[PDB]
Design a protein around this ligand. Structure first.
Ligand SMILES: C#Cc1cccc(N(O)C(=O)CC[C@H](NC(=O)CC[C@H](N)C(=O)O)C(=O)NCC(=O)O)c1
Ligand SMILES: C#Cc1cccc(N(O)C(=O)CC[C@H](NC(=O)CC[C@H](N)C(=O)O)C(=O)NCC(=O)O)c1
Ligand SMILES: [Zn+2]
Ligand SMILES: [Zn+2]
Lengths: 172, 174
């Protein structure tokens, strides 16, 4: 069926004043092996590791990455934490300890049964130059820019197989 | 055991110059019913609908929401599109047509087998006041602020059952 524009925007309320300072701070993905994930997101995609949080009692770690200047990261732990969680658009990678050593274990990327989550997306100045570099670095592709239905956008995968869209906001 | 700081920090490369101006623009979630979802994300959570995209041949729509001023949205379609997709931290809701009419259909939130995706998280000035309003609005909870293992953060659910974390950066959990 699909919604008309008028129906859709009619379902949209103006923000309640109590929500005016809310910000979309994080997207969380579970990762099998942070050694592989951290290398991918920093070296291939150019994100910065803001903070590493460990929870020994609960046997997991959290890695928060974002497009931020590392020199802006506060050194003091408490000041670092308050800064990290106040950033927009961070990526939280969750490491349940031991998964990297378990050959039977893997996470699900949400694009096959059972579906839900789809992807994260990166805005880039140039999809084609970006994917050419990706190709040279051995990155695995779901969708090269000119394949599939929508031309000029790409899907690559991280070491867990999560889809990452590559897009140019000025060519859509 | 888990990685030492030293191992972890050693796996991090400085950004390649070619990655300059890269930004984390969107998180995409599939939604059963855009009527419920748009109402939830705008009225309950205070996000703004930036742009609606329809693809009739493939029978799906895309809804991009973000914490942005409605008045900053360009009126012209081409200018609107370039603006929407240049925003940081947008939420893309994907509606495959017909799902809302199929009582057997539902999406998986990634927090049960098979796990993967976990949640999106909203930073708020006050988790407790935010969750009190959520309760008052009939919002469904996974984890009220002082329940579960980490105190002072909450998980609520959207109409598809996706987890949304509620957190206060100036009042860290536990
Ligand atoms: C540039 C650009 C641009 C323009 C519009 C939308 C998007 N993004 O952010 C998409 O995710 C659309 C992706 C699209 N999304 C869908 O098709 C969603 C519907 C699908 N049935 C699903 O459930 O995933 C897809 O996966 N296409 C693959 C292709 O073209 O080969 C980007
Ligand atoms: C404020 C704040 C704050 C501080 C630290 C971390 C976080 N975030 O964003 C979390 O995701 C922690 C959530 C946590 N995440 C995990 O426990 C990660 C490991 C888990 N086994 C998994 O796979 O998700 C969880 O689900 N706990 C809920 C509860 O308290 O009962 C927020
Ligand atoms: Zn989180
Ligand atoms: Zn997308």
């Amino acid at each position: 069926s699909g919604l008309t524009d008028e129906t859709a925007f009619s379902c949209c309320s103006d923000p309640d004043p109590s929500t005016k300072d809310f910000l979309l701070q994080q997207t969380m993905l579970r990762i099998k092996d942070p050694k592989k994930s951290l290398d991918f997101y920093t070296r291939v995609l150019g994100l910065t590791l803001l903070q590493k949080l460990d929870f020994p009692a609960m046997k997991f770690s959290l890695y928060f990455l974002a497009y931020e200047d590392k020199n802006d990261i506060p050194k003091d732990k408490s000041e670092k934490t308050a800064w990290t969680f106040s950033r927009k658009a961070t990526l939280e990678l969750t490491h349940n300890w031991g998964t990297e050593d378990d050959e039977t274990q893997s996470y699900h990327n949400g694009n096959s049964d059972p579906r839900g989550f789809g992807h994260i997306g990166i805005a880039v100045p140039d999809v084609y130059s970006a994917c050419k570099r990706f190709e040279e670095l051995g990155v695995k592709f779901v969708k090269k820019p000119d394949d599939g239905k929508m031309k000029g956008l790409a899907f690559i995968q991280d070491p867990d197989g999560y889809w990452i869209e590559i897009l140019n906001p000025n060519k859509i």
